[PDB]
């Protein structure tokens, strides 16, 4: 269950103004950026070049710039018919998925205004079920007018992408599989609606973690359980609240892969 994917966020504001944002992702880990000005990749890590040379990556940038040229040109050209469509966003998520012993899957997904529009399935562009009259329109163009770019998309997501990914997963194996121990602490806030005890766990990596409130050896059903949130490090944050009567036998138990069997136990006083 290992994958690579790029994301493109196109904001078409007016007939003469459109902006693009782009990034490379190894699961929920950003590996690449995109300098929109020069039209080049931003290597976020020493290992984010994978096993590709500078002449191979140079040609990927040249390929990307060419696609941005043709995409933006065609969209603006067709939107130069009806301006009530403006402003609108176009989001692309294209990449590959690798499987143990199985042939690698490739995906190319398009969303118009935060709603699925297209999909590239086998050798053919598929419109989204129901949602989209434009989906059938644009799929017709792609399948009948852009056969050539379709076969360079096919090649990219099914051949270039796995080749790239495998070399990146090899290059960054130590960072991607690193284990970072969580920093944990307790804090208390008065309950606006009684007192709220907060248990924090931060700077842990990978994402899976378990934060529990205890009363001696008994687990204690939390009041509010947070979402795992990012830190700029690449690490994570999680908090669990327990509402209690003010002022005593309460601990918080942080459980994480990095801690090798032993959990961090924090006592309140």
């Amino acid at each position: 269950h290992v994958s690579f994917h790029v994301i493109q966020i196109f904001s078409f504001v007016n007939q003469s103004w459109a902006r693009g944002q782009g990034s490379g992702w190894l699961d929920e880990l950003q590996t690449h950026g995109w300098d929109s000005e020069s039209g080049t990749i931003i290597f976020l890590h020493n290992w984010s070049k994978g096993n590709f040379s500078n002449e191979e990556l140079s040609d990927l940038e040249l390929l990307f710039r060419f696609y941005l040229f043709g995409l933006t040109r065609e969209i603006q050209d067709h939107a130069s018919q009806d301006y009530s469509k403006y402003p609108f966003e176009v989001q692309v998520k294209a990449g590959c998925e690798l499987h143990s012993g199985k042939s690698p899957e490739g995906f190319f997904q398009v969303a118009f205004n935060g709603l699925d529009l297209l999909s590239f399935q086998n050798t053919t562009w598929v419109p989204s079920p129901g949602c989209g009259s434009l989906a059938q329109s644009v799929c017709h163009l792609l399948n009948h007018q852009y056969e050539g770019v379709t076969e360079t998309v096919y090649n990219l997501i099914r051949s270039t992408c796995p080749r790239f990914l495998l070399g990146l997963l090899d290059a960054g194996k130590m960072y991607v599989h690193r284990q970072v121990r969580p920093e944990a602490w307790l804090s208390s806030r008065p309950s606006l609606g009684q007192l709220l005890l907060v248990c924090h766990a931060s700077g842990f990596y990978p994402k899976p973690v378990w934060v529990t409130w205890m009363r001696n050896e008994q687990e204690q059903l939390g009041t509010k359980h947070g979402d795992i949130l990012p830190n700029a490090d690449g690490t994570w944050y999680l908090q669990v609240i327990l509402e209690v009567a003010s002022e005593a036998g309460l601990s918080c138990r942080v459980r994480h892969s990095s801690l090798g069997g032993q959990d961090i136990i924090l006592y309140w006083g």
Partner: T-cell receptor
Amino acid sequence: QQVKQNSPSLSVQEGRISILNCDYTNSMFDYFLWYKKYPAEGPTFLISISSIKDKNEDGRFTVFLNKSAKHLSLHIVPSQPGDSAVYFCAASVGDKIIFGKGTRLHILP
Amino acid sequence: AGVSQSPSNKVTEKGKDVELRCDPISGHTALYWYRQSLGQGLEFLIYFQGNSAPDKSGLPSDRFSAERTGGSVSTLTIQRTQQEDSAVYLCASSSYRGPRMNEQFFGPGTRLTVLE
């Protein structure tokens, strides 16, 4: 030179196979094309192949693509007098198109 | 009408300035410029992705400059022409639409001959 056409010239008897060869160095080339050029005329498109495929047949013309060897090959069968021209292989990535230095095929009648 | 080039042939004395024109196929976003020297193959010069030139690297010297203000008709100017500039300057255009990626359409070429 990222696209190399060694053998600047070839001589083949009318009625026999003509094999034009080409070697590329760029792992990023996704499309390969062949052009025929007559003296005093500009090159004309002949046949192409995507790096998805490994063979393409159109009439007397066949392209073969070996991505392991990074070899591209054109076969004219049977070859006839009007096949005498210069042949260029091209390879592309995006809008970058690299051309070989050409092969003058002389069909001896 | 296909890809066209002006003039068909030019014979000049060293030192004169020479302009070469290219009329691509209407619609074609890409315009390329090459030259063919006697005892050489296709030597890339410059190409245009629209009315902008991404690769201006094949240009043999500062005297050589190209323009596609259009971006339709493109011109290649050679200032103070020299014996080494004598070649068949070829032009080609292509579209990203269609079943073929980068099928170029070549013009008939301009044979440039620079004499002492």
